Scaffold this active site. Structure first.
Site, PDB file in Angstrom:
ATOM      1  N   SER A  46       1.086  -1.378   0.131  1.00 25.78           N
ATOM      2  CA  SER A  46      -0.289   0.062   0.481  1.00 25.78           C
ATOM      3  C   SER A  46       0.824   1.220  -0.304  1.00 25.78           C
ATOM      4  O   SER A  46       0.486   2.396  -0.402  1.00 25.78           O
ATOM      5  CB  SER A  46      -1.180   0.005   1.195  1.00 25.78           C
ATOM      6  OG  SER A  46      -1.634  -0.731   1.225  1.00 25.78           O
ATOM      7  N   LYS A  49       0.854   3.397  -3.451  1.00 26.20           N
ATOM      8  CA  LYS A  49      -0.502   4.143  -3.334  1.00 26.20           C
ATOM      9  C   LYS A  49       0.001   6.036  -2.911  1.00 26.20           C
ATOM     10  O   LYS A  49      -0.516   6.954  -3.983  1.00 26.20           O
ATOM     11  CB  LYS A  49      -1.024   4.740  -2.177  1.00 26.20           C
ATOM     12  CG  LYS A  49      -2.535   3.207  -1.941  1.00 26.20           C
ATOM     13  CD  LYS A  49      -3.608   3.351  -1.242  1.00 26.20           C
ATOM     14  CE  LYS A  49      -3.934   1.539  -1.479  1.00 26.20           C
ATOM     15  NZ  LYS A  49      -3.671   0.658  -1.176  1.00 26.20           N
ATOM     16  N   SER A 184       1.082   3.362   5.897  1.00 32.20           N
ATOM     17  CA  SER A 184       1.247   1.729   6.021  1.00 32.20           C
ATOM     18  C   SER A 184       1.298   0.911   4.852  1.00 32.20           C
ATOM     19  O   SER A 184       0.600   1.561   3.644  1.00 32.20           O
ATOM     20  CB  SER A 184       0.437   1.836   7.068  1.00 32.20           C
ATOM     21  OG  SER A 184      -0.722   1.782   6.485  1.00 32.20           O
ATOM     22  N   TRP A 186       1.046  -3.561   3.812  1.00 31.05           N
ATOM     23  CA  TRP A 186       0.929  -4.600   4.392  1.00 31.05           C
ATOM     24  C   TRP A 186       0.714  -5.837   2.823  1.00 31.05           C
ATOM     25  O   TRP A 186      -0.404  -5.671   2.403  1.00 31.05           O
ATOM     26  CB  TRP A 186       0.018  -5.127   4.866  1.00 31.05           C
ATOM     27  CG  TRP A 186      -0.157  -6.258   5.862  1.00 31.05           C
ATOM     28  CD1 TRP A 186       0.885  -7.883   6.103  1.00 31.05           C
ATOM     29  CD2 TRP A 186      -0.484  -7.391   7.071  1.00 31.05           C
ATOM     30  NE1 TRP A 186       0.598  -8.966   6.339  1.00 31.05           N
ATOM     31  CE2 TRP A 186      -0.488  -8.610   7.491  1.00 31.05           C
ATOM     32  CE3 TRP A 186      -1.072  -6.411   8.226  1.00 31.05           C
ATOM     33  CZ2 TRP A 186      -0.369  -9.277   8.134  1.00 31.05           C
ATOM     34  CZ3 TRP A 186      -1.177  -7.099   9.738  1.00 31.05           C
ATOM     35  CH2 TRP A 186      -0.810  -8.642   9.589  1.00 31.05           C
ATOM     36  N   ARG A 226       2.577  -1.756  13.422  1.00 32.88           N
ATOM     37  CA  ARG A 226       3.554  -1.219  12.705  1.00 32.88           C
ATOM     38  C   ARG A 226       3.857   0.833  13.113  1.00 32.88           C
ATOM     39  O   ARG A 226       5.508   1.307  13.495  1.00 32.88           O
ATOM     40  CB  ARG A 226       3.279  -0.555  11.850  1.00 32.88           C
ATOM     41  CG  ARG A 226       3.618  -2.553  11.050  1.00 32.88           C
ATOM     42  CD  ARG A 226       2.760  -2.578   9.958  1.00 32.88           C
ATOM     43  NE  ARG A 226       1.751  -3.180   9.745  1.00 32.88           N
ATOM     44  CZ  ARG A 226       0.021  -2.939   8.648  1.00 32.88           C
ATOM     45  NH1 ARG A 226       0.806  -2.020   7.502  1.00 32.88           N
ATOM     46  NH2 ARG A 226      -0.803  -2.482   9.352  1.00 32.88           N
TER      47      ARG A 226
HETATM   48  C1  LIG Z   1      -2.092  -2.461   1.025  1.00 34.45           C
HETATM   49  O1  LIG Z   1      -0.690  -2.525   1.805  1.00 34.45           O
HETATM   50  C2  LIG Z   1      -2.687  -3.354   1.995  1.00 34.45           C
HETATM   51  C3  LIG Z   1      -3.655  -4.132   0.624  1.00 34.45           C
HETATM   52  O2  LIG Z   1      -2.483  -5.364   0.226  1.00 34.45           O
HETATM   53  C4  LIG Z   1      -3.700  -2.981   2.754  1.00 34.45           C
HETATM   54  N1  LIG Z   1      -3.271  -1.466   3.746  1.00 34.45           N
HETATM   55  C5  LIG Z   1      -2.866  -2.750   5.132  1.00 34.45           C
HETATM   56  C6  LIG Z   1      -2.147  -1.651   5.694  1.00 34.45           C
HETATM   57  O3  LIG Z   1      -1.876  -0.505   5.841  1.00 34.45           O
HETATM   58  O4  LIG Z   1      -2.747  -1.981   7.209  1.00 34.45           O
HETATM   59  C7  LIG Z   1      -3.885  -3.094   6.131  1.00 34.45           C
HETATM   60  C8  LIG Z   1      -4.071  -4.512   6.144  1.00 34.45           C
HETATM   61  C9  LIG Z   1      -5.286  -2.342   6.247  1.00 34.45           C
HETATM   62  S1  LIG Z   1      -4.952  -3.605   3.212  1.00 34.45           S
END
Ligand SMILES: *C(=O)[C@H](CO)[C@@H]1N[C@@H](C(=O)O)C(C)(C)S1
Length: 243
Positions: A46, A49, A184, A186, A226
């Site tokens: 993410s 973005k 953030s 993941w 995190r």
């Molecule tokens: C992006 O990294 C993911 C989509 O795979 C989304 N962002 C995560 C985050 O930043 O914690 C999420 C677990 C909300 S899903």
């Protein structure tokens, strides 16, 4: 020196492999349980973005006030079954909105742009709405901090107002006139799962300290860790004190 020690003592809790990279426009500093992670390229997840939004606005594929209507198909999180602006979707990590954006950009333009700006390994494969979530695009935490530091300073190769718009999409909180900007990430669709928390602290003086938490993730890890870890480090470093 002891500041550097106080930071490492936080990482005694952290069983996972992790690294916390900082940058002040001059010196890179590394902290954590596994320091080679700073030189290692991982999928952006993410945190892409930021680049996506920049590329989209720069090339007139969207505006910051434009609303990306929900298609009615229930998404991965019920929170995403809603209309969003790029900024609202940035805060919510609304993957389908940025997937739509990437599709509007197209694979040709996305390629040349990532090459133009030198974002990580600059590889997108054949699926323009998936590369940041499953590869082949990779980027090191050192590359993330230099990239996000330039966003802060308006030094990325983009329109000032474009950089401005994306910057405020990342705004989290302020303490005094020190402002926290962050994103953030993941990488849930790859082994090993990668966890990001990338941003910067803008002190009103004008001085910026960019940061990047990069760590190992596992199924069932605490989603708040995190950010919380990153703020605990920023506090101990004296960059962003608690109240
Ligand atoms: C992006 O990294 C993911 C989509 O795979 C989304 N962002 C995560 C985050 O930043 O914690 C999420 C677990 C909300 S899903």
């Amino acid at each position: 020196s002891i500041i550097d020690q106080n930071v490492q003592a936080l990482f005694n809790e952290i069983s996972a492999d992790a690294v916390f990279v900082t940058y002040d426009g001059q010196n890179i500093k590394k902290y954590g349980t596994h320091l080679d992670r700073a030189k290692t390229a991982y999928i952006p997840a993410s945190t892409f973005k930021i680049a996506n939004a920049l590329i989209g606005l720069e090339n007139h594929k969207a505006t910051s006030t434009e609303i990306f209507k929900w298609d009615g198909k229930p998404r991965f999180f019920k929170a995403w079954d809603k209309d969003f602006t790029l900024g609202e979707a940035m805060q919510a990590s609304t993957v389908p909105v940025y997937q739509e954006l990437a599709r509007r950009i197209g694979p040709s333009l996305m390629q040349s742009e990532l090459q133009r700006i030198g974002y990580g390994n600059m590889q997108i494969g054949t699926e323009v709405d998936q590369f940041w979530l499953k590869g082949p695009l990779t980027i090191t935490p050192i590359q993330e901090v230099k990239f996000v530091y330039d966003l802060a300073q308006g030094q990325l190769p983009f329109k000032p107002e474009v950089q401005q718009q994306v910057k405020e999409m990342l705004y989290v909180e302020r303490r005094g006139e020190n402002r926290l900007y962050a994103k953030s990430g993941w990488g849930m669709a790859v082994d090993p799962q990668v966890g990001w928390y990338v941003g910067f602290v803008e002190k009103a003086d004008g001085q910026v300290v960019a940061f990047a938490l990069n760590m190992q993730m596992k199924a069932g890890d605490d989603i708040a860790l995190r950010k919380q870890l990153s703020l605990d480090v920023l506090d101990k470093l004296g960059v962003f004190h608690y109240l």
